[PDB]
């Protein structure tokens, strides 16, 4: 039963971390496309 | 807005949901065990006071 509890707390910790790394990638990805879409729009206007 | 990562997010959330739930059940099993032992120990003493 402590072996059972251990297993749950590991699934919850690996779950935390995976979602915490998805948000980071996402943030990182949206800004990058946002910075690039804006630069391309300025080149248009140049 | 990649559809692979969003689906990894569903996976991340479920895995975490099910784990929390697992732990809600253990705590119930926990309550239950400490209750069974209370009846067991209380019975035993009754036995030693009737024999």
CB pairs under 8 A between A and B: 47
Number of separate domains in chain B: 1
* CA-to-CA dists, residue A17 to A29, A41, B25, B48, angstroms: 18, 36, 23, 55
Technique used to solve these coordinates: X-ray
Query: What are the structure tokens assigned to A21, written together?
Result: 């790394």
Give the CA radius of gyration of chain B.
22
The angstrom resolution of this structure is 2.3
Domain that holds residue B35: 1-51
End-to-end CA distance of chain A: 68
> How far apart are the CA of B24 and the nearest CA of chain A, in angstroms?
10
**Of B31, B25, B8, nearest in space to A7 by CA:** B25
Q: Quickly list DSSP for chain A.
A: -HHHHHHHHHHHHHHHHHHHHHHHHHHHHHHHHHHHHHHHHHHHH-
């Amino acid at each position: 039963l402590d072996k059972l509890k251990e297993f749950g707390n590991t699934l919850e910790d690996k779950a935390r971390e995976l979602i915490s790394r998805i948000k980071q990638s996402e943030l990182s990805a949206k800004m990058r496309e946002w910075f690039s879409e804006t630069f391309q729009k300025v080149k248009e206007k140049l």
